[PDB]
Amino acid sequence: MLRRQARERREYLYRKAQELQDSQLQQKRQIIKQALAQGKPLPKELAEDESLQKDFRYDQSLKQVDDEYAATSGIMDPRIIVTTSRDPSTRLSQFAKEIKLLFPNAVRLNRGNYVMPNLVDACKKSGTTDLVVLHEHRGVPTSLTISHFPHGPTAQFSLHNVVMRHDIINAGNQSEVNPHLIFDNFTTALGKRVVCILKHLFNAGPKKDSERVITFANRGDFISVRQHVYVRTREGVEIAEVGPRFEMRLFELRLGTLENKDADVEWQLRRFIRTANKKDYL
Amino acid sequence: RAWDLIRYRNFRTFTGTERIQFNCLAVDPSGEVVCAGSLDNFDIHVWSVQTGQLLDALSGHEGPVSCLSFSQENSVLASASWDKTIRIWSIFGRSQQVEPIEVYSDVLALSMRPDGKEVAVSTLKGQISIFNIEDAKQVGNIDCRKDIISGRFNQDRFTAKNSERSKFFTTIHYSFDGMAIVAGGNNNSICLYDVPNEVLLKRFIVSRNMALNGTLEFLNSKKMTEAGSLDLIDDAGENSDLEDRIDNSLPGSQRGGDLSTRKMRPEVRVTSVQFSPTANAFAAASTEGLLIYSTNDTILFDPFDLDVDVTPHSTVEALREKQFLNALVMAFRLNEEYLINKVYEAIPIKEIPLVASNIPAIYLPRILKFIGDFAIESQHIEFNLIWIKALLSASGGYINEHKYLFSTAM
Amino acid sequence: YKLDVLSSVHFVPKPASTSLEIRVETPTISMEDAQPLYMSNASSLAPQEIYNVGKAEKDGEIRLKNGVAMSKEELTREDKNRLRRALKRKRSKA
Amino acid sequence: DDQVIGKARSRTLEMRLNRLSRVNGHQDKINKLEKVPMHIRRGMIDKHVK
Amino acid sequence: SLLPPTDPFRRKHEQLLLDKLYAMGVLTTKSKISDLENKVTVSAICRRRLPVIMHRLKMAETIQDAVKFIEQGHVRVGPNLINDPAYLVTRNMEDYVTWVDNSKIKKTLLRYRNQIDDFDF
Amino acid sequence: AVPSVQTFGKKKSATAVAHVKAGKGLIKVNGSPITLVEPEILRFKVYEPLLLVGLDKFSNIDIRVRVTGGGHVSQVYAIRQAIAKGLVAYHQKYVDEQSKNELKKAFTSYDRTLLIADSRRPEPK
RNA sequence: CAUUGGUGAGCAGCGAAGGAUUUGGUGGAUUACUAGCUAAUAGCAAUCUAUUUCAAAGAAUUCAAACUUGGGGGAAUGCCUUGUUGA
RNA sequence: AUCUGUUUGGUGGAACCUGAUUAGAGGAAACUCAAAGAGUGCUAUGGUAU
RNA sequence: UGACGGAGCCAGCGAGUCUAACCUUGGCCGAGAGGUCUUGGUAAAAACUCCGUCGUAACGAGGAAUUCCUAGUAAGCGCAAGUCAUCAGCUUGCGUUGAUUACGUCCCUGCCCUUCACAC
Ligand SMILES: [Mg+2]
Ligand SMILES: [Mg+2]
Ligand SMILES: [Mg+2]
Ligand SMILES: [Mg+2]
Ligand SMILES: [Mg+2]
């Protein structure tokens, strides 16, 4: 096991490095294809590259979701573990339960004295696809980190204006159908990356008449999360909040499991640069 | 692939999603669930026989799954791996539980007692360890490394004694009685151990052919030269016919192709062993073929509770005096087949129900074995059926209480 | 073949594909190898395979997989409605 | 282009690629006669001219 | 290659041949189809031989040294000892290459780090 | 050279290293006699191997055990496991294998933790 | 204080005209023991060869014969096949 | 000095990077056995042969 | 299932020439700036084992309702770090001691799914 994971990751890192190099050659093959179809003369560098023209003959017959999810996207449903920080207060335990109910295939595991390297290794054995850890401050959730196994990525979020369902009187019980997912206003390449991470947490192929909808709405990089149950009426659709409400803002994203503090950082939040407030990345 | 023998059809075929090779297999007693393990996946796939769908993929091993087996009674699944652990899965039931048991070394083979209460595992250290499933604690251990006979190959540069090539048992199996284990590996020995006392009953040499590579512990010094072993010199050139001279061997192959592909001599090894459900015999697959060892000749004299008064001569008068029960019991005490046969056929049909009820409980397993061995090839179909009817009616309750003592006989 | 033998047959399985076979009804003995013994005598096609009760040949008649046949003249109006609804459900699931 | 198979497809692609190259690629580097020894090449030319 | 570019048969077989070679380890990458003609070489197959793979895995200092250990019966792939220095190790089998349990080599490794446990041996 | 074997026992973070050599029945833990191991309530725990197989076997060997890490209880379990493993290893290497088998049988009959490490690895459910 | 580090100086104990370490060479084994040579239904073993030659038998239109080549592209002059010119 | 801590020389050679090499790199013996390279010495003298 | 004192002894995380008070009383030097000293006040591993001594206005373990929890889990104990968001009215890690009770049931309450052999 441990050897294979190390070997596989090294093979992946090598593959990515080659692909970045191979990007230039891929563009060159596109120019050759366009010229042959349209008839325009080739550029000088291509016209003089005898090797590429020969290699093009074989490569003529060459033809999305992120790579880590590509293997199992839509094939195996995800398996999720939702845990918390050591000695969690009561409110975080209730919040952790709500996150467990949000995701259909989530399981709530108690973190009393579990060591973080031991935690991931136990989860990797049991086939867990994703791990969620929650932090709190005086019984108010503050952070949420999502780690995708076997080799990342790890996305860390900060939760604001959290309003739990336990704060509602006579709320009732949730419905646990495969919910419909709404991802609105995710445009940048990072935004697509964030959407892919959050999308694969849910089971594939919700029923067309499923009456539960989860929406992640990006509004100035503060991703709003809402949960609703709808009824299609004769002159429109009416919806009702099920909760919880919270706004989650990405502040880190690393290529590795949350245990590995050495994982290469794909993106971080730079708060002190001069033009920080000007642009919104998501 | 599932085969139906009554019509010789591949009535169902299962396949994993991730394109995984399968090396071990185990089938539920109910014939409704099939599970297979791999050397490439670390997971035990499970399918439903009736529908063919993949029920689930059991995970938890950190090494490839080397073997599997279902309990005939309890229906638990016991799996072992090169992870140096054994896991008991309660897949049936509302709730799923896994109970891992650690071992000293890698596990290569596993056998389940017909009771379903214990499991024996052969490790790479050369140890057959028996564990109790319900308690998940060890109940015995058998050393095998000294027992195993392994031969130096012509190509090795190291002695057989220092050789660690095969000093473990890659397959094992219980006797249906539950008291004996027969083991074999990539070696020149089939060892039969007795579980309760942890002793080697007998050892069998698989082959005595020097054409096979692993037969001999000590090689002739004359073959060694400055050039090397004379056997390692390839003499294909001398062969008169072209098809003999041509060499088609791939440089690095070891298994999965024709002998010509190897370029090296076949190696003596026992791929698998099993006991006979119906007779006191066991079959061992090897390179030469399936060697079947049986006790059918039974030339041995193995009297049981014999005394001075019991004699082959003395038995005959008990027939002449019409004391059939005393004749029959005395026949078993000598345990002579020819005498038991003589008494068996001389008893009149009128007295069979009388005698059958009065046979001592100790000798009931023996007679049932005899009738089973005798009836298959004997011409007295009705007479045996009268006997079988008499015994089962008289001692049906006793047989049910002791199932595994009477399993092969029944 | 050459690559598999070279790698000691530690290869990776090929993509699964679906193909059609034609099974010809024959006595099971013929499928066996040649020696003075046979181990089964049944036919190579199961009874369902020989004849499966299907749709009624006559339009008025309604025939079900259980073998029950009802001609529409027999059926009461409630029965006619009930069977029509059952046909609607059976079509919908397919 | 879809139907053509065999040597014709290999020769067709090379002819198309050379034509596009001649416009911009320098004459020396775009086209290079395959190396053949002296005595052979005069033999091929003499017969071909014949 | 000579088959027409858009042909489904061409794309299918070429992809199969790329995956098979990559799994064996002959091909480092599966991206470009030209690799079948450019990057298929005898040296590529040789580098997957057991002596070289140990050297890359640092189980030996040099290829010649690693060959000697195979002939000495110190090296196992899985539970099977191997004395043939031409064993072609696939990518998945490369994880199971290890010293024999009682090898003097294995004792030196643990002794050098003061981690030798004589119960195991 | 003097015949000697080395073994390890581990319980949580407590690790014990036991050297067993030919000698005169000198058992020590951290440079002190085994009788002084604390806490006294669990002292017999450390004695469990010595009493199971009999002191006669130890009369011919010296055992030196160095313990580090963990708390009191984990250190006690590390010490007992190290002593048992070291004794079995010494009987394997420099005495008959039959005695090795008898020792293993006795220890596994009493408590298999004396030989196999007890690792309470987490299991998600 | 501990060395399960090296090099030494000496006891206890073991202990019959000495004890220990390394090493060259040959012999017997490492598969189950019916004898040597030749022109072999017998001679020889000191060989003959001064009878060792004749006789008889013995020749597929198979008059076929690379099952034997690393991949791609060619091959002037060669070689194979087919046709053709003139004797 | 249970003072101070820079420098010189010796011991040792983690990471990164660069260069060369690669059936890893060496060492010792000779009246040993080979395959080659350079220079040097020798009247090295039939222009048509007693 | 106390308090006081003494003794014995056991962890794992953590290494930026970087790590950390305030307000006063006065002497002397100095053109000044300031330098040095003097002076009072304020603020700022544990568990565990053994031994010895004493001794059993508000509040004495917290109602009704309601929430959470299945193994190195609940609970108890301390030590570190503060890692671009949050956090010091605190947050996150680290080790130590470590249980009881269930691991069945769909009876109640919710949520969900259904209407290629042999045998059925
Ligand atoms: Mg707690
Ligand atoms: Mg705390
Ligand atoms: Mg906290
Ligand atoms: Mg349950
Ligand atoms: Mg000698």
Curated annotation (Swiss-Prot), chain B:
Keyword Repeat: yes
Positions carrying Phosphoserine: S240, S253
WD repeat windows: 17-59, 60-99, 102-141, 164-203, 265-303
Coiled-coil portions: none
Sequence segments annotated as region (Disordered): 242-263
GO MF, any single term: mRNA binding
GO CC aspect terms: 90S preribosome; cytoplasm; nucleolus; nucleoplasm; Pwp2p-containing subcomplex of 90S preribosome; small-subunit processome
Highest taxon above the source species: Eukaryota
Subcellular location: Nucleus, Nucleolus
Family listed: Belongs to the WD repeat PWP2 family.
Subunit-structure text: Interacts with snoRNA U3. Interacts with MPP10. Component of the ribosomal small subunit (SSU) processome composed of at least 40 protein subunits and snoRNA U3.
Function description: Required for bud-site selection and cell separation. Also involved in nucleolar processing of pre-18S ribosomal RNA.
Protein name: Periodic tryptophan protein 2
Native source organism of the sequence: Saccharomyces cerevisiae (strain ATCC 204508 / S288c)
Organism phylogeny: Eukaryota, Fungi, Dikarya, Ascomycota, Saccharomycotina
Gene designation per UniProt: PWP2
UniProtKB/Swiss-Prot annotation, chain C:
Location(s), subcellular: Nucleus, Nucleolus
Domain of life: Eukaryota
Family according to the record: Belongs to the MPP10 family.
Job description of the protein: Involved in nucleolar processing of pre-18S ribosomal RNA. Required for the early cleavages at sites A0, A1 and A2 during 18S ribosomal pre-RNA processing.
Oligomeric and partner information: Component of a heterotrimeric complex containing IMP3, IMP4 and MPP10. Interacts with snoRNA U3. Component of the ribosomal small subunit (SSU) processome composed of at least 40 protein subunits and snoRNA U3. Interacts with the SSU processome subunits EMG1, IMP3, IMP4, KRR1, NOC4/UTP19, NOP1, RPS4A, RPS4B, RPS6A, RPS6B, RPS7A, RPS7B, RPS9A, RPS9B, RPS14A, RPS14B, UTP1-UTP18, UTP20-UTP22 and UTP25.
Protein name: U3 small nucleolar RNA-associated protein MPP10
Organism for this UniProt entry: Saccharomyces cerevisiae (strain ATCC 204508 / S288c)
Included range, full protein: 446 to 539 of 593
From Swiss-Prot, chain D:
Signal peptide range: none
Location in or out of the cell: Nucleus, Nucleolus
Function: Required for pre-rRNA processing and 40S ribosomal subunit assembly. Seems to act in the processing of 35S rRNA at the A(0), A(1), and A(2) cleavage sites.
Subunit structure, as described in the record: Interacts with KRR1.
Protein name: Protein FAF1
Organism: Saccharomyces cerevisiae (strain ATCC 204508 / S288c)
Gene encoding the protein: FAF1
Region of the whole protein represented: 199 to 248 of 346
UniProtKB/Swiss-Prot annotation, chain E:
Top-level taxon of the source organism: Eukaryota
Record-level Gene Ontology MF annotations: RNA folding chaperone; rRNA binding; snoRNA binding
Keywords: Nucleus, Ribonucleoprotein, Ribosome biogenesis, RNA-binding, rRNA processing, rRNA-binding
Localization (cell): Nucleus, Nucleolus
Any Gene Ontology CC annotation: nucleolus
Annotated GO biological process: maturation of SSU-rRNA; ribosomal small subunit biogenesis; rRNA processing
Keyword tRNA processing tagged: no
Primary location: nucleus
Transmembrane annotation, as ranges: none
Residue intervals of the S4 RNA-binding domain: 48-114
The protein's assembly and partners: Component of a heterotrimeric complex containing IMP3, IMP4 and MPP10. Interacts with MPP10. Component of the ribosomal small subunit (SSU) processome composed of at least 40 protein subunits and snoRNA U3.
Function: Required for the early cleavages at sites A0, A1 and A2 during 18S ribosomal pre-RNA processing.
Homology family: Belongs to the universal ribosomal protein uS4 family.
Protein name per its UniProtKB record: U3 small nucleolar ribonucleoprotein protein IMP3
Organism, as annotated: Saccharomyces cerevisiae (strain ATCC 204508 / S288c) (Baker's yeast)
Record lineage: Eukaryota, Fungi, Dikarya, Ascomycota, Saccharomycotina
Section of the entire sequence shown: 62 to 182 of 183
